[PDB]
């Protein structure tokens, strides 16, 4: 399933949510339908944490997540950090990042094995990503889009990239990430695919205005069947 969901009318689910294999994060100011989608589809096996990052309802663009670790910005308060430490399982590691770009979901596009980052990140932050997430890192842009997290949706099975992407960039990124990539649109043609939707190994959640060919492209590239 690519599950049709709105955040109070918003068809961008990746902005307000962060979904990994092991956990899920949702914003505190959410509707009953928005919570019920993650509660029904994810089930009781996977914890869902209602969280606020840096005083903001936006959490997907603020944080970058992995099954092994979670990265939070410097502006995240101690109460939010302690609540995430209690609510999250003991396996994941939560570490604050002290870096100027500070919006880790926009900066970092990552999965379990390999990650794409903004080219201009600091070397200490790159080593921190490689340490906490245990993930090999490449500094690359998707056809000149420096915000790889906003302009790519990535999982273990496959990836969706920006629609206006050069084909040469598509095989280059596909060989670099060792996963097949498809250029496509989400939410009735919105270009920002990573902000448009969240995905993991068995679930994808998207906006209600995402059309049927777009949803078919999602389930084909992410192998959710």
């Amino acid at each position: 399933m690519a599950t049709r969901t709105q955040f109070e009318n918003s068809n961008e689910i990746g902005v307000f949510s962060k979904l990994t294999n092991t956990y899920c994060l949702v914003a505190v100011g959410g509707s009953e339908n928005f919570y019920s989608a993650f509660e029904a589809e994810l089930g009781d096996a996977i914890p869902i944490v209602h969280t606020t990052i840096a005083g903001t309802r936006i959490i997907g663009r603020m944080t970058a997540g992995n099954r092994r670790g979670l990265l939070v910005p410097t502006q995240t308060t101690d109460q939010e950090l302690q609540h995430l430490r209690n609510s999250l399982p003991d396996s994941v590691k939560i570490q604050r990042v002290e870096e100027r770009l500070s919006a880790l979901g926009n900066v970092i596009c990552c999965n379990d094995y390999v990650a794409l980052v903004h080219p201009d990140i600091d070397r200490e932050t790159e080593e921190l990503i490689s340490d906490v997430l245990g993930v090999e890192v490449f500094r690359q842009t998707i056809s000149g889009n420096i915000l790889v997290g906003s302009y790519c949706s990535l999982s273990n099975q496959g990836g969706l990239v920006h629609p206006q992407t050069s084909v040469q960039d598509q095989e280059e990124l596909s060989s670099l990430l060792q996963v097949p990539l498809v250029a496509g649109t989400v939410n009735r043609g919105s270009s920002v695919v990573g902000a448009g939707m969240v995905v993991n190994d068995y679930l994808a959640v998207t906006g209600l205005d995402t059309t049927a060919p777009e949803l078919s492209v999602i389930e084909s590239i992410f192998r959710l069947q």
């Binding site: 505190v28 005083g55 109460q79």
Partner: peptide, 13 residues
């Protein structure tokens, strides 16, 4: 003080 308004954007802040 820590604000307790269930529905405000500054809830529990």
């Amino acid at each position: 003080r820590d604000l307790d308004r269930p529905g405000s954007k500054f809830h529990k802040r």
